[PDB]
Write a protein that binds this ligand. Structure first.
Ligand code: NA
Lengths: 71, 73
DNA sequence: GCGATATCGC
DNA sequence: GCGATATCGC
């Protein structure tokens, strides 16, 4: 099993912000959540927390890649 | 990424076999809804025994598969 | 990961 | 507790 690609900083945030978006948009569609998630993401000026996490997730992915390639 | 895949539970064997059925009975049903629906059918199923035997047999093939894999140590 | 259900302890 | 096990976009 080849490692799945790492979660992006965008997706890391979205996972954490999905209930919030749904609370503020009752009955909202998965498709519309994505569009909304993008509005909030483009608006969020300080993405440091998510960029920091995506950075480590990248490192983890790299290590899983290392382990998958050599044995 | 080479050892035997863990054997499937009675519920997963049933769902895998019923998925396409559930999907055609609810056109467009999403996977999360197929799962939701799976839980419903499973909690209500009168007799799981056939599914449990299949799960038990999958476990046996698995335990066997694991002995072969660890046979040379 | 998560959403959506449900087991099992390589 | 959680990832694996199925599924499968996001
Ligand atoms: Na249950």
């Amino acid at each position: 099993d080849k490692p799945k690609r790492p979660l992006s900083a965008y997706m890391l945030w979205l996972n954490s912000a999905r209930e919030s978006i749904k609370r503020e948009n009752p009955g909202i569609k998965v498709t519309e959540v994505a569009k909304r998630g993008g509005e909030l993401w483009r608006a969020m000026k300080d993405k440091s927390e998510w960029e920091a996490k995506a950075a480590k997730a990248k490192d983890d992915y790299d290590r899983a890649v290392k382990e998958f390639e050599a044995n």
